[PDB]
Amino acid sequence: LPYEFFSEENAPKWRGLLVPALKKVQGQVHPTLESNDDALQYVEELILQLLNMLCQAQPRSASDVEERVQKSFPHPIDKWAIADAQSAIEKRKRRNPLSLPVEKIHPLLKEVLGYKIDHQVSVYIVAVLEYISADILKLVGNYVRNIRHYEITKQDIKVAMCADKVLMDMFHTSGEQTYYDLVKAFMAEIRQYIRELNLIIKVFREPFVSNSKLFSANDVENIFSRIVDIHELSVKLLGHIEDTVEMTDEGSPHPLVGSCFEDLAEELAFDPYESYARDILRPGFHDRFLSQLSKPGAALYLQSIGEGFKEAVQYVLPRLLLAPVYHCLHYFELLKQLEEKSEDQEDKECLKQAITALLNVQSGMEKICSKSLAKRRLSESAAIKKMNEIQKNIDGWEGKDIGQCCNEFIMEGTLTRVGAKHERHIFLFDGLMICCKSNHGQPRLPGASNAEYRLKEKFFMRKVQINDKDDTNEYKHAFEIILKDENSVIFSAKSAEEKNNWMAALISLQYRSTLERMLDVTMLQEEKEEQMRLPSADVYRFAEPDSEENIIFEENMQPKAGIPIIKAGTVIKLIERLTYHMYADPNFVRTFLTTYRSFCKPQELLSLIIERFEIPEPEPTEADRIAIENGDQPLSAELKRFRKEYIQPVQLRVLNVCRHWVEHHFYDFERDAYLLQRMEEFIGTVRGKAMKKWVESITKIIQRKKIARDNHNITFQSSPPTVEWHISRPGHIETFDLLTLHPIEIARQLTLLESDLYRAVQPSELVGSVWTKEDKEINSPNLLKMIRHTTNLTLWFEKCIVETENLEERVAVVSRIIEILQVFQELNNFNGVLEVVSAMNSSPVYRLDHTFEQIPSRQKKILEEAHELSEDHYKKYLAKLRSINPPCVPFFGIYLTNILKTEEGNPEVLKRHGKELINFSKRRKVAEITGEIQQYQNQPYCLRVESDIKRFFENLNPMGNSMEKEFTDYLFNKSLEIEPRNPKPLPRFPKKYSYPLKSPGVRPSNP
Template sequence: MQAAQLQYDFFNEENAPKWRGLLVPSLEKVLNQVHPKLVSQQEALQYIEELILLLLSMLCQAQPRTVQDVEDRVQKNFPHPIDKWAIADAQAAIEKRKRRNPLALPVEKIHPLLKEILGYKIDHQVSLYMVAVLEYISADILKLAGNYVKNIRHCEISQQDITVAMCADKVLMDMFHQDEDVINGFPLIDEEPLVNEEQSYYELVRSFMSDGQIYLRQLNLLILVFREQFTSRPMLFSHHDVDSIFSRIADIHEVTVKLLGLIEDSVEMTDEDSPHPLVGSCFEDLAEELAFDPYETYAQDILHSDFHEHFLSQVSKPSSAVHLQSICEGFKEAVQYVLPRLLLTPVYHCLHMFETLKQLEEKSQEEEDKECLKQAITALLNLQSSMERICSRSLAKRRLSESACRFYSHQMKGKHLAIKKMNEIQKNIDGWEGKDIGQCCNEFIMEGTLTRVGAKHERHIFLFDGLMICCKLNHGPPRLPGASSTAEYRLKEKFFMRKVQINDKDDKEGEYRHAFEIILKDGNSVVFAAKSAEEKNSWMAALISLQYHSTLERMLDSALLREEKEEQMKLPVAEVYRFAEPDSEENVVFEDNVQSKSGIPIIKAGTVLKLIERLTFHMYADPNFVRTFLTTYRSFCKPQELLDLLMERFEIPEPRPSELDQLEGGEQPLSPEVKRFRKEFVQPVQLRVLNVCRHWVEHHFYDFERDPQLLRTLEEFISSIRGKTMRKWVESITKIIQRKKQVQVNVPSHSITFQNSPPPTEWHICKPGNIEQFDLMTLHPIEIARQLTLLESDFFRAVQPSELVGSVWTKEDKELHSPNLLRMIRHTTNLTLWFEKCIVETANLEERVAVVSRIIEILQLFQELNNFNGVLEVVSAMNSSPVYRLDHTFEVKSN
């Protein structure tokens, strides 16, 4: 797709200023819609802007005058299935009911510019339709790039991320690079090679969480995309048929969501002083509930010897085949070949979980956590032995990264290993020409031997995500100068995966046995045959995964979005729950175009209620805001008011029952709406209220030391909380309170370890024990400076951050809010006055000069000891009115 075919050039010197940057702010809004927690570099958004302008150029080439003209152009030029989804979005945008939710892209700015491109004025509806198509594609690109960035555990999208993600997506590659074999400047891997080191506890937890999110997406794919097509046709597939194929996949999904939620809560509530998050109790609680038992039933069903035969009998029925083919192109093949491999994913994940538990137990540095992990492992021993017995009996030895499963995992841990593997394969192929494999592929999928129908010899096939390379064994000398004489294979042909179609050849035809067909764009085709049905299934699973991965991913995104819209969570109304008031300019202000690295909006100002709501927000945790708020809140809110608001925030009223529930009366089972409300709103909010309380007592306990009633109220509140999920957090807060109570009030810690022993005490005229004679001139100046520095160090370390916020030491209740700072200020003032007194009370000039000299010696020692407060005390004394006027003293001193 090239803009050059159109006379209007978006990128020449005259037109570029009109378009450059026009879409970037809107693309940020689109990103916020599809990935609220991610941010993007400006270069990445500018790159997407260029792609969108190329797309606009293509739409304008048809000289559209009506909405139908644009729709025809989309159907003709957009690859399937993105064409129908883009059209559906655009149709929704021009419907009157959708105008309340305007598009993110600037229709009003683009509409007048289209007249300049087309040479004639078009209807606003046509412009709206075109912009809606562009917005759908931009959202699709950002969704894809965001998923890739999350998989590699980054939080910012770069241009390289977009390029790599698009390279792995057949639909977008067909749209933007139809005639290219490779994207120019395809990025080479620039990250540091991964050293094969053992992971720490924290790294294991983060890795398990990341893998868990990918695994959860696979489960959603199984349930919302595949199983849904079976359950929606009860006339074709009975309830028993569906259960026999998918077994207890829903129960496994439920326990996975629960486990990931518990681990995320533990990570969020981890104390800053703790060496790592404590997740042992998460596994122990679920293991004691036997929550992981569905895995055993699932493995027995999926790995049963009759499973595959029964599965094929269900999907091969003529009526079933027609239904599956009607869903979308390639879906029948995906069900037949990809689904059986994808169904193995929970089995592999369960075995992976057992290994992770052992590693966590070995790495844990907390005895209590180690004991929890040990108990979890013990509780799961029966399940583990059952799973291993089932797998050893029924499952061919495959690794977790086996082709079809790996394709859906998108594990990016071994990128350097993948590049190394590609280079090794390329060096082992005689006759290789053109771009390197690593420039058009991201990963190696599989290799094996196939028979090419019509050829004399077998072909050794290397399959990558972007290429299929066919070779034969090399028995002759190298054909190209400089080629390795030890090359094991000789290149016969190669196919770009996005330029071919995979066609299954029915074994019943007789001519072909275990065969499939590669159809090229020019109409030619190549038929390959495997040695057995199992081999063919492996090849077809990998090939169909590559062919229709984009389609399945988009079907999943669409299903997740539809599910979210259908299950809108009903929140309490503001009349009964003050924290449910919608955001507005009157109650909260956010920083413009500024987000934290985690994608969380930064609050600039807000009412106290809104600040408490965001402090304990149900959608995300913001630890930076918690720290900032607890340091600064005293300037606008009293501690007792804060505690009252937190307790009010904790008590969340449930949505009112529906009229039907009220009519039926009696004890009704919890509706899905109430379950979701408790899980996605009540539990996160209550957890974050406890998290704020924990941070408060851990880092700002002085608020409770100054007000015993405040502490009693908090303890009563904590002790009143019930519920298993909250138990360990209540215990954590209680332990912190008990520990803080044992520490002497306002006494700084002296448990400081020095590298060397303290120096011996220096004495001058006055000797030890003769306290009555201690004075400025009788004590050694070194010892005066040392002792004052130690004293002022204690004063300084006792000052809390909150005492420095908002000049509270100058306001009402300053003794309550800044006691340590005021103590330090008074000490500084008194010491300055004492220096002045020592100078002006001397009897004659000589004594006065001696006293000033001694004080200056102390100043120099203060400076050596880095006691800048002491330096300020001496300087203040010297600059005071009674001392500053002593001209004769300073004249003698200077001479």
């Protein structure tokens, strides 16, 4: 009685160990695909199925297990598996121990097996289980990567299974054409293309290069013909295309890739494509080819390398070599889509220069492909509505709907079954074979089927192998098929033309898998052989390894964890992650540039990014010296494979953070004249091929800023409300006063004024309490400028009140100020609103009972409304702000208060092993708050600025040349004068204003 899989006895012991572990394996093969618990719960059921049959043989030693593996597991999967499991016993260095919980599997093994086993045996068993787990995810991951889905599901796992012959032997739109999308699409296509290239180079071409005595130099050329060159180009192009996008900020319609093509086209890099397109479409190509796998030694070497290898190299490789053609033709038809949909002038200029330089190459192939022979090979190599028609075309079909096991049809032709009376039309489908007898034109009885065809039987199409010989006997252009538990059927064709057609699609299905597998094995192997030493930690500080005393990460923030994030760490490590060669982080670069002045200085940062930029190259070996001035020179090629792949990412990001720097921090270089000087001189030293583009990028921005500082008047969308005139004629700045100017006009101008101030505020001025530092004027020019405004305005209000001795007039004044509040409220100017509340809560005013008595009851409710904005920690206010759309002027007070609580609630540094790490968590938390500030800086108000009035409020000097304390006392003293205490009589003060005291008021004009 084999051990149950559920298991009916022990169920919660086989479902809570695999799912959590396999999720990590998927990130090892395809770090670009998402995990799905549903899919992972299906894989564990497969891995468990394997664990049973392996324990059936009941091995007691690590040697008895190997036997069961070589027998059950097909080839060559059994040879690579035993090589991996052995690596576990050799105790040799490995990426990581068995991902799957070994201490969870070990006890359960002795239960299923039935007896005691050494720990060395268990590890060997799980080792195999690991190789198989990763093998399934590696396969299904490929298909998900090909269909461009980016997500894996339990469903697509089944599809990849059926496509196999090994795993089945053991387990048994879019009309839209946006400019940005085509780039992301092409980049996805070129990635698949490059993968196919590596398949042709490291799987097909490698064997011909390995065996020299059989295949010579020119012998290989006659087959592939400059295929490597095409690869080195696609990589570079894929490089510059990923770099241009990585440099494109969010404030841009689309990356400028036009310059990229211009460089390659100017160098005529698309020439090897022409040489290739010819050597492949030649009339005498297939001849030299087929006459290459027939020569002595060839037919035997192909088989030794792998089983079924020969069949694909002869009936598939030719079709794979046609890819670079269609690929190259795709560029031309794509560049034209760029010039048409280019949103930039300078960009479109580089597009024309590219297409023009590729006219000779385009016109070339456009005529090479139009050949009477070449054109016939192109159309050949080139839901669901089709399957229903084909299934319908079948009469009395006894199988399950074709769509049960088939998603597509490969080809449709005719063949003659040996021992078969009539030629059978054949429908080709993935995982299925269809045979029918034609009855076209033949008479039928009324009511009987009218279908053209008639099919007797069907085949699985899994695990079938074909061998053919154009024998003396009446067998020609035929293939051999082995029915399971059945005699093989020979299928003949009319000519070799169709023979290759069938052999193509057929061999491709069952053989494609072996390729993708052998490719991943090779690629992975190459990365291991290439030993790369980390830069000397003595000459390069950023090279020092990572630990728990120089850098920290958070587990909470990220479960995968996926994208890494840092809690704290020294400035060195911080900059390392700021320009981490492996991956690029946009969020971190933004945050860092906003909150770096709290623990690092501008001059300091510049000096550090330079150190990070310039990296000492590994000293050439002794043999490189004698050859550095002579032929047969190393050329440091082995070093370039790392230098080029390390320098680029590292230095690219150094120029990236340096790009954002000179764009969103132009004030830093404006504050220190020497800082900018260093910047322009550091760029001058930066030299290189593609480095020019990014250099011109930085320089262009720097010049753009300088011309911005020197000498505006932007326009907005209609329509601006007509300005409201006051009792005093326009232009008369002298008569300007609270009662004189028109209520709503005053609010508009103050709203504009306070809005610019708010927008001007840089999130930097609010980090590390730089406004509290003695050097407040330097770090927070805008913040302070805003604060001073609120003070002056509020004071001005109180001054307009207490100085109005006459009660009748002071009531008017207070009444007017309340009206101005209303217009702040409707203009979403919460600032000005609360600036009025402050004057109404001031000592000199809050005590004027006699004044606040003679004001309308309708206005009191308006004032009391605002008084409630402060209550409950600005609860009412915060709720109101979230229901408001810009333009609006937020109350800045709330932000300052929170920011403080954050920098006081969190230690500036974290102590680890006596060391001191810069707590970056604070920096982010603060940035989160500063974000809520920028959210409202986007859209300005739609109001026409009036020079005189704007100036008037900019020149507000209530205190005159007095001090805060002095002037405030005076106000309170005037309050005790205009309204004495209860016992003291209330004097009758004369009127000061000799103009109409009646409000307009607060009523916009119809026009």
